[PDB]
Amino acid sequence: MRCIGMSNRDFVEGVSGGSWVDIVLEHGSCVTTMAKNKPTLDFELIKTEAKQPATLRKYCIEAKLTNTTTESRCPTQGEPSLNEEQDKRFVCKHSMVDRGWGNGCGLFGKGGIVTCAMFRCKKNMEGKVVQPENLEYTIVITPHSGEEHAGKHGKEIKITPQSSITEAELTGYGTVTMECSPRTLDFEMVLLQMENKAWLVHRQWFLDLPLPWLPGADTQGSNWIQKETLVTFKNPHAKKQDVVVLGSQEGAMHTALTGATEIQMSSGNLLFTGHLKCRLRMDKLQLKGMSYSMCTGKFKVVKEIAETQHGTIVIRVQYGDGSPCKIPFEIMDLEKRHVLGRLITVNPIVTEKDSPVNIEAEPPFGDSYIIIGVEPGQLKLNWFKK
DSSP states (O other), X not given: OTTXXXXXXXXXXXXXXXXXXXXXXXXXXXXXXXXXXXXXXXXXXXXXXXXXXXXXXXXXXXXXXXXXXXXXXXXXXXXXXXXXXXXXXXXXXXXXXXXXXXXXXXXXXXXXXXXXXXXXXXXXXXXXXXXXXXXXXXXXXXXXOOOOOOOOOOEEEEEOTTSXXXXXXXXXTEEEEEEEEOOOOOOOEXXXXXXXXXXXXXXXXXXXXXXXXXXXXXXSOOOOXXXXXXXXXXXXXXXXXXXXEOOOOHHHHHHHHTTSOEEOEETTEEEOOOEEEEEEEOTTBOOTTOSOOBOOSOOOOOSOOEEOTTSOEEEEEOOOOSSSOBOOOOEEOTTSOSBOSEXXXXXXXXXXXXOOEEEEEEOOSEEEEEEESOSSSOEEEEEEEO
16 A cells, blocks of 8 residues: 555566566655566665764864863973873963063073863764765565555565675565665765764865864774864963863854755664665566465445556455455456456455455556456446546
C-alpha cells in the first residue's frame, strides 16, 4: 500500500528473461517491478547516512580560565619565564611594562613580564568530512501481495558503494539480487556539528575560523591551538596582569551559519537525501503459493473500490467456500470474450476466512468487467476507466 499511495511511482519490467533490470531509486519515491511468473516487488530508498566520518577539527566555542599567574623582571635582566609556559593547557603572553623604584627595580625603564592562565574548554563544535564511500543507503524491498496488517515488513537491506552485490531473501518468494551505485552529492565541503544540530559548510572557511582548535584525531581535549582567539590580555602592570576570556560564541556562530544548508541527523550520524541507480535480477524469485486450489466460493467486496494515482484500482475482497486459496481474477470486455488489462498483484490469494485481501489491478481504458471468483456467484463488477 505504501507505494500505491505515493505520487512518485515508476513501473519497470524486464524485456528479457533472467536479464538485469535497471531502476532509479529516490527519496520519497518508489519503484514497482514486474515480470512474467514472478512476484511484483516494491523498492524504496528510505535512508542515506554517513557512519563515523573522519573528524577534521574540533573548535572550542566557550572556555574558562583558572590559575592566572604573572612573572616580571626589571629593565636589563632579560625575558622572564614560567614553567607552565611549557604546559600545553595554558595560554600565555609576553609583554613589556614600565618598572622602577616604586616596584622593586633599581632602574626605571621597560621590563619583561609574562602571564599564563590555564585554558579550559567548556563547549566545542566539530566539523567532519563525509567520504562518498562509507555512506550507507537503506532500501526496503516489499512484496506486492496485498496481504493485510493495520509482521509483514519488506526486507530491509543496507549497502555501501563498496559492498558487493546483494542477495536479499524475501520470505516465501526466494531471493532477489541487486547492486547499486551512488550515481551522482559532493564532499571539498565539511559538516559542522554544534550540539546535535549540523550544517554543511565549505572548507577553507571552516579551517579559517578564528577559534581555538585541536587536530581531529585528539582525545585529550586539552592542548588547544590559538587559544588567544578567546582570550584577552589587558595592559600589564609592574607585577600583575589581568586576563579575561570572551563569552560563548555559540550565538555568534548560529546567527553566522544562517544561509548554509542545514543537515538533519540522529544518533550522531548525519543524514542526507541520496540518489541511487541499481540493477536487479529475479531469476531466484518465484511466486508464493503456486500449486494450490482455485478458490471455489464467494467474495464480498469489503468496501468501495478505490482508484489510485496510477491508472489502477485496489479491490478489497474476502472469502467463503474454501481452503486458503488462489482467487480467480480476470478483467475482460463487456462481452466477456477476451482478456483485457492486467494484475499488479499477482497470484492473489486468501490466507484466512474473513481476511480482506486487497488486490491492485490495471483495467483497460474505457469499459471492462472485473470477474472475481467462480460459478455460484462469479462477481461481475462493471468498471469505466477515464
